[PDB]
Swiss-Prot record:
The lineage of its organism: Eukaryota, Metazoa, Chordata, Craniata, Vertebrata. This is Saposin-C. It comes from Homo sapiens. Disulfide bonds join C5-C78, C8-C72, C36-C47. Glycans are attached at N22. It comes from the Eukaryota. Residues 1-80 form the Saposin B-type domain.
């Protein structure tokens, strides 16, 4: 009833300790200029538009604006029943 909740808190928290700031946002926003480079045109505009919306936060959000344990909740991995 709480096996993955702990494993998801010990790993998502330990990884955070290293993910905390091991990779900056320079190789990220650039990566998008690479993977989101072959994306079709339509979804390449929504993939670069969202990046601006998911670039400095997405990387700085799971880290501080949020705690590693909460993520396990947002992810809903402790699903005891079938999600409604």
């Amino acid at each position: 009833s709480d096996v993955y909740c702990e494993v998801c808190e010990f790993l998502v928290k330990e990884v955070t300790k290293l993910i905390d700031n091991n990779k900056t946002e320079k190789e990220i926003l650039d990566a998008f200029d690479k993977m989101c480079s072959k994306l079709p045109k339509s979804l390449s505009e929504e993939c670069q538009e969202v990046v601006d919306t998911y670039g400095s936060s997405i990387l700085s959000i799971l880290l501080e604006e949020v705690s590693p344990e909460l993520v396990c909740s947002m992810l809903h991995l402790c699903s005891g029943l079938v999600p409604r």
